[PDB]
Amino acid sequence: PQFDILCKTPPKVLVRQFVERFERPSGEKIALCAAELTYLCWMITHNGTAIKRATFMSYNTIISNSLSFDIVNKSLQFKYKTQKATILEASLKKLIPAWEFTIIPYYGQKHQSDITDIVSSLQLQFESNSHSKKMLKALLSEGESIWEITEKILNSFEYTSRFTKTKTLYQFLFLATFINCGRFSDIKNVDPKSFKLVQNKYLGVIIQCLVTETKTSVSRHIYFFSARGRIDPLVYLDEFLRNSEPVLKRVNRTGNKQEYQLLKDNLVRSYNKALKKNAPYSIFAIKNGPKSHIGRHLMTSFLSMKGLTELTNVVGNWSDKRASAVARTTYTHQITAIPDHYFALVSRYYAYDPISKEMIALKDETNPIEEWQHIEQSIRYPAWNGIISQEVLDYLSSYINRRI
Amino acid sequence: PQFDILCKTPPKVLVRQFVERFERPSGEKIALCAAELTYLCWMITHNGTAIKRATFMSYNTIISNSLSFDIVNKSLQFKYKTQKATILEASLKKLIPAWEFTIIPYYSDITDIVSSLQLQFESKGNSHSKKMLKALLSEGESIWEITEKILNSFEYTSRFTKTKTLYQFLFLATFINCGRFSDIKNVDPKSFKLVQNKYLGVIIQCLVTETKTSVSRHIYFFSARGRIDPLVYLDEFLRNSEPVLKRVNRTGNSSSNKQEYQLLKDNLVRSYNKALKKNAPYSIFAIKNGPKSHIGRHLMTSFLSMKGLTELTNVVGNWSDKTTYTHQITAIPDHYFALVSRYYAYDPISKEMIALKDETNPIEEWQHIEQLKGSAEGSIRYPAWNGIISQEVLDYLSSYINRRI
Amino acid sequence: PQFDILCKTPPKVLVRQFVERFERPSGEKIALCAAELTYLCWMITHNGTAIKRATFMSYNTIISNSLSFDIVNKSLQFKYKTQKATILEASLKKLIPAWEFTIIPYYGQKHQSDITDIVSSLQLQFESSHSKKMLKALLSEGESIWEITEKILNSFEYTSRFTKTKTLYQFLFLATFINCGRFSDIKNVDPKSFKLVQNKYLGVIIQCLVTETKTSVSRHIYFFSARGRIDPLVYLDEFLRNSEPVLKRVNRTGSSNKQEYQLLKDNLVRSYNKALKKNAPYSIFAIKNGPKSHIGRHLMTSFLSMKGLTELTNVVGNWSDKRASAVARTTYTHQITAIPDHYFALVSRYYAYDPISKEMIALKDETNPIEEWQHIEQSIRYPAWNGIISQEVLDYLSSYINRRI
Amino acid sequence: PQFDILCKTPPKVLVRQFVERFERPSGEKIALCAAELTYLCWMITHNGTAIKRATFMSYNTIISNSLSFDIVNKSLQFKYKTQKATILEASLKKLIPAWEFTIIPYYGQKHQSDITDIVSSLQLQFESKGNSHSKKMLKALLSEGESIWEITEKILNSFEYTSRFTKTKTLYQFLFLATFINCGRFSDIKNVDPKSFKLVQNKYLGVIIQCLVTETKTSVSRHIYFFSARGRIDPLVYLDEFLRNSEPVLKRVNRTGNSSSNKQEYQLLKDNLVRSYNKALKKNAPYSIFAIKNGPKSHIGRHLMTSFLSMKGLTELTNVVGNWSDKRTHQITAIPDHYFALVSRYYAYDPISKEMIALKDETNPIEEWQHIEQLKGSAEGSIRYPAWNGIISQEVLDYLSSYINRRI
DNA sequence: TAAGTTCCTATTC
DNA sequence: TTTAAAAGAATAGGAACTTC
DNA sequence: TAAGTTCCTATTC
DNA sequence: TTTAAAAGAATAGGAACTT
DNA sequence: TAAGTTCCTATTC
DNA sequence: TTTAAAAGAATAGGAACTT
DNA sequence: TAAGTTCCTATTC
DNA sequence: TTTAAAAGAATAGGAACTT
After folding, report:
1. Is position B115 within any domain?
2. Which of A329, C118, C217, D245 has a CA that sits 20 to 30 A from residue D75's CA?
3. For residues D123 and D126, what is the distance between their CA atoms, to the nearest angstrom?
4. Which nucleotide is nearest to A218 (CA to C1')?
5. Among A93, A320, A334, which would you mutate to test the D interface (most chain D Cβ atoms within 10 Å of its Cβ)?
6. Last residue in a domain, options A80, A106, A132
7. Closest to B403 measured CA to CA, from B363, B372, B358, B357
8. What is the distance in angstroms between the Cα of A368 and the nearest Cα belonging to chain D?
9. What is the CATH number of the domain that holds C15?
10. Same structural domain for residues C59 and C175?
11. Shortest Cα distance, chain D CAs vs residue C119, angstroms
């Protein structure tokens, strides 16, 4: 992974190699500066500000395809997302003053085709985003409940798994996203060292952790709790920890700490291929449709259909808009916390009262606060000890036994 | 109809037939290239995206009144709505190399202005139209009185009961929802549902997806105190009409038709407009190019402006008012129905709905009806809608109608 | 009044005279086409659309000051509010091609004064927003709006030379305050529209209509019976008797729409300002460029907000609606919002508002509105207004002035 | 202070003193033209509109660090924030004909973004923030165990034994609590008009004390409150200690308007209190955030309340509580009643229903309000708040007086 | 019969 | 106080047929 | 004394 | 999913005094 | 095996 | 009727390898 | 007279 | 912090006249 390489390559060491491809003019030394060219352009236009991993690989792909240098007239050009082609020109010039560079725009979204091309497609389609939303739209409206649709998705990994480790991963990730209404990254980037028990006036306690590197860059919390029924999150967490081990936090920019991350970066690939083939519904058959994002859409729906749509924004970590721009930027130092009655509804021990607005306890023999009171009065999860709070490894352990 | 035939011929046959026309440079084959050309220019400017029926027809006509050519020199021109001409022209020349294509944009001399201004100093179709609309509303009569007169101008002027039925139902339905003809026509029959409203107990709801702006909305029917009762009109309609196969209206030739039936017939609007023109007891209806079936939109819209309730307008009429995955449509607020049902009155001061002293309250009757169970009768009086509209609804309407003397 | 003249001058007759000032190049014939240059420019950029009176005179004043023509090298310069200087150039050219015109922008004449000018002022002010503050403090000083009005109203009684003016000024003021309107909102009223309307509090009321407004959205004007030391009906009575109808002035270069009379004269506002200015019963009227006639509006505005009834303001003041979509307002709205009945109840002083339970509590008094109404229910006192003002009303007003001491 | 003196000299004098400097040019007389120049450049670009104290000072400094001239070639230049340079330069040449004025834009054409100056910096970094270090600490101070109400008690107590006099102890405590309770700035409390105190009723506490502030950073007026609170931290108590130990302050003039419309006679606090307060805070507050150079000091109250609301999922009250612009005889937007129910600590915000729930705790506040409104004729208020007698409505001083004495 | 249809052209959202 | 120009997608009207 | 002030310069809204 | 550049107006820090 | 990985490229937030 | 175009960042896919 | 008018110009919606 | 610039339309003012 070259982006990693770059991060290691020294700046001056870079500005050098770049100038070393023009004194020895060739179609082999220039046609490879792709990555360097990218890194350069960024720092130039952003005044030496770091660049994130994904943002780079995207801009990199673009150059590769728009790269064109003049054989012997000494000209050069490519596509790059900038509104300052001018200055970038003047800057690139003062590097290899013997050439003339040109920055071409990126309209990637829309490209005109050849009539014979357009026609060929049309004829094909004749004899043979939107679609995706419709499919999911219909699924929800067909006998099965979110809770049932999840069960089929969850169980469908049971016997299709080659190893026992993957079965444990996939199965975890899914249930993970659904519960926290999160993305893949929201689950992967979790900092294990942050697991800790928090209280709740319904389930007694719960497991909490933190994610910092998110898409909106607004950190959030991730939870794991006790569910009454044929599915118990704590159980899948348990099975997860035992067959899995810590992961060295990857570097994500040309720049603070955090050495570990709850999951692997490529896990998402095998998870997509899994759902793809082992598809328990037609929606996963659609190309470019939702795969891992499914866990989020699912919990999204579940909450809206209960009227509790407002509760969605919080759980999904939607960027706030009510508070003024500056107030969010320099005065907000604590993130919004998920309300206590949220988990009561997802733990299945309670139900929501759309009218009087209350959490009605569902008649059951297993009381969450009591199974809590007994286990209240270690090294079952090796590899995670010394990293994950003992306080928690202790809680988890005794729960797996006390409750059949 | 042209568009329908066009939706049938395969893309490759469309091109062939087009190139075919210029191999034997003859006026006869070229003059008929308008539909083909229209289809072609779109697919070029939209990289293969489907074309809608209405849009196609509109564009075709613009070409037909503008198609000009010269067989000697081999040049051809015409008008078309677009910015990207060069791309288009070029693209066309490719297909047919020996010809030169010129696209003319379908889109203020000081003297032409001075003349018109002068010709005016000595002596609109819209101005005269608004004038009349203002009057029809300003004068004595209220909206509800105006509705009763229009709705009755059909009672003894129609040829068959079936047409009497549709004309009455379609008008009441456009006024009640502030909807267009298409808003009611494109309704999916299988979508009828019983939804509860805290003022009337229950309300009948149906959905429409294929709408002018492509933004879905609901269509309703409910009880109303007085001589004009929507449910009654719904009743007469259902017994005298049948479902209609959904007409396809996109060249998408997609495997995703989904909607099987539609509520009314596309051609109904033409006969309805004529009846209205020859019988409505208002002068507005005799002004060339003036609102006809679109009258119910003008009526309801105005009603709300007067009642100082313009906050319900965009949502009732479905206009744009400045979590996309699996989108859900904005619902119309319950009070709206309390008002239009005529059972309640809107109180300015408190901004609340006040029931009327009038004896029998609607929430009550709803209960008396929800009670008695097992009324398979619904199925007997609405045979042609059996299996399409939920049994729950036909049984309800059936019960409401029979329980009212 | 030249604008009036223009309106009468024929278009071609104008395009002519304009070209007749360049064949005879002079500093006398060109320096006077100020008005023609204006009329031309407009129709040019607006594609021959009429122009309003006030809009014209504003643009006119601008040219006057920005006029500059080249002595002998052919060309003209002036300021004119347009975003199409280009086309207006090409048009103006094809009139007197022998010249080169130039359109200069207009920046609210915010011309950086000369330092010596700025300094001079500063030094002056040294040895020697504000308006809003004053009015802000007045409301917060013992006296009530009703008291502040009384002092303003009475302050005209003796300061007035004749008796007709005392009647006018005194009417206008109370007028605006009651209808929360501007001057034009009261002036343009069409007398022929007076009519009695009902109210579940005062029994009946007098209503009329204004069409030519600032926002162009017509509105209603009212006059009713007030309990206490001030009774609007009384000032109306006194108004009609000493005043007479006015020929509606023409306000644009149009058409054939009509209205022959307007409730008041155009220059009345002048003598009304000078009156408040000198006879100023408060310091706020002493402020230059401050509110004069607009005071009646600001006053009623405050009165209403202080009663929590701020929402009720928008309606009474005829504020442009924004909730309903642009097109919905433009082509479907044919009836204006009506002032709520419980409004006048509060301004008649017979009732009071109940901020809590939200009700109109009747104030214990011997004189009942509806009863003084019931008796007068079971002519030519206002001559000159008969045949123009509905007899129905002249009859109502008359008998009220008497039955009531 | 320069500004004050400038508000005293007549316009004709300044301009005179100024031009004088260039007629018989001396190095000493020119270098002192900064204040005069500032004033002049503003009055030119604003056609005589008044200049504010802070703005004047800020602009003066930019000129002082940039004034350059050639007495020989009679040329002078400097920096100044404006678009209209030509107009300004020209105007200046008029006043002094034999000189050439050149205005240099105080800007951000951004760092002279030299690719190499950047490569150097990026490199110097690859081998080896104030804004960043500051946020970091703020996040921690809130994330950890302690709650806002516990953090408030500790900061508020860091003044109890280190204050030299009781008067300062009193101000520091009051000022902090007031900035947190209203999510306001120092100026928001300082500029309060003492004569505007009023008793307003709130449906949760019965009554609330309200005062007004007009001269604010964005020039949009707002209210400032004080009320009862269940627990060890009670605003009214702190209000009580302040009033008894301080006195009114003559309104300082802060505009060159030299207007006859001063209106406001007194102000609540002293402009210079912020400096002594900031120091006290820097040496004693029990948190590391307080030791970071250029970090929030008196502005800490704003950060605390703001955050509290975000956490409580009540960001709909933020802009109105802190007085930020929210894209919509003027009247100011009032703060919703529930806000005070929450902060008073007598009620709790219920998420599910979104309603305020009183706490089982015995004595309800609405009740006591009644027991107090009862007994009449307590001229006592006038006795314990002498220095505020005649300035603050008798109604209020009698109320506070009764509240404080009726609490054991 | 002429109200209703059908299939485009002209107009207005 | 109000503000636009142009591709898209309906609704209204013209002729010549159809027919409970 | 060493916290408090006063009157600008540097920084951050 | 988010998006700015620059005139205006505060708050925080530095020295040298005061009380 | 044929389910998992790598490491970019293509699409969708 | 309806109306922003781009920059900044994750989530699917493609194709050759690995176990 | 000095409160009203005329008829544009200057300001404020 | 806060943030649009202009076109389109009435409401005050200025100065010479009129009763």
Report:
1. no
2. C118
3. 5
4. H1
5. A334
6. A106
7. B372
8. 21
9. 3.30.300.80
10. no
11. 6
- What is the number of domains present in chain A? 2
Resolution (Å units): 2.7
Do residue B51 and residue B172 come from a single domain?
A: no
In a domain, A119, yes or no: no
Task: Collapse the DSSP code of C1 into the 3-class scheme (helix H, G, I; strand E, B; otherwise coil) and give the result.
Answer: coil
Q: Which nucleotides in chain E have some atom under 7 angstroms from a protein Cβ? A: 3-13
Residue D261 class from Cβ within 10 Å (0-12 exposed, 13-18 middle, 19+ buried)?
exposed
CATH number (domain holding residue C361)? 1.10.443.10
Q: What end-to-end distance do the CA atoms of chain B give, in Å?
A: 48
B208 forms beta bridges with B217
The encoded tokens of residue C63 equal: 């040219």
Domain span including residue A61: 2-106
Sign of CA dihedral B335, B337, B343, B348: positive
Please indicate the experimental technique that yielded this structure: X-ray
Outline where DSSP puts E strands in C182-249: 190-199, 203-210, 219-223
| Strand residues in A180-256 grouped as ranges (E) | 191-200, 204-211, 220-224
Q: Which nucleotides of I are covered by protein (CB under 7 A)?
A: 3-13
The three-state secondary structure class of B169 is helix
CA distance C261 to C191: 7
- The amino acid at D101: F
C185 and C90 in a single domain? The answer is no
Which structure tokens are listed for C58?
A: 């504003």
Closest by Cβ to C333, choosing from B114, B120, B305: B305
For chain C, the chains sharing at least 3 beta-carbon pairs closer than 8 angstroms are: B, D
Question: Rg for chain C (alpha carbons), in Å?
Answer: 26
Q: How far is the CA of B161 from the C1' of F14 (A)?
A: 27
- B155 and B265 in a single domain? The answer is yes
Q: Yes or no: say if A252 and A53 are a contact pair by the CB < 8 Å rule.
A: yes
Q: Which DSSP letter does residue B194 get?
A: E
D251 shares a domain with D155: yes
| CA distance linking residue A156 with residue C145, whole number of Å | 77
Task: Decide which of D78, D106, D134 is a domain's last residue.
Answer: D106
Amino acid identity for residue C293 in this structure: S
D45 C-beta less than 7 Å away from strand H: yes
**H helix or E strand, kind and range, residue C135:** helix C130-138
Q: Which of residues 160-219 of B touch strand J (CB under 7 A)?
A: 212-213, 215
Considering only CA atoms, which of A28, A46, A395, A354 is closest in space to residue A203?
A: A395
Burial A143-170 (b: 16+ CB within 10 A, else e): eeebeebbbebbebbeeebeeeebbbbb
DSSP state of C249: P
One domain, residues D227 and D315? yes
Contact B187, B263 (CB under 8 A): yes
Distance CA B43, CA B45 (A): 6
3-state secondary structure (DSSP) of residue C278? helix
Would residue B15 count as lying in a domain? Answer: yes
C-alpha Rg value of chain B to the nearest Å: 26
The answer to the question of residue A129 being in a domain is: no
Token readout for A94 is 């003062």
Q: How far apart are CA B314 and CA B301, in angstroms?
A: 9
Interchain CB distance below 8 Å, D329 and C132: yes
Distance CA A63, CA A108 (A): 12
DSSP label of A362: P
DSSP secondary-structure letter at B383?
G
At D52, the amino acid letter reads K
Q: Which residue intervals of D365-393 are DSSP H helices?
A: 365-374, 380-384
Statement to judge: residues A67 and A203 lie in one domain: no
State the burial class of residue A344 (Cβ atoms within 10 Å of its Cβ: 0-12, 13-18, 19+). buried
Smallest CA–CA distance, residue D329 to chain C, in Å, is 5
Q: Most C CBs within 10 Å: which of D41, D88, D329, D331, as the mutation test of the C interface?
A: D329
Distances (CA, A) of D388 to A90, D195, D242: 67, 9, 11
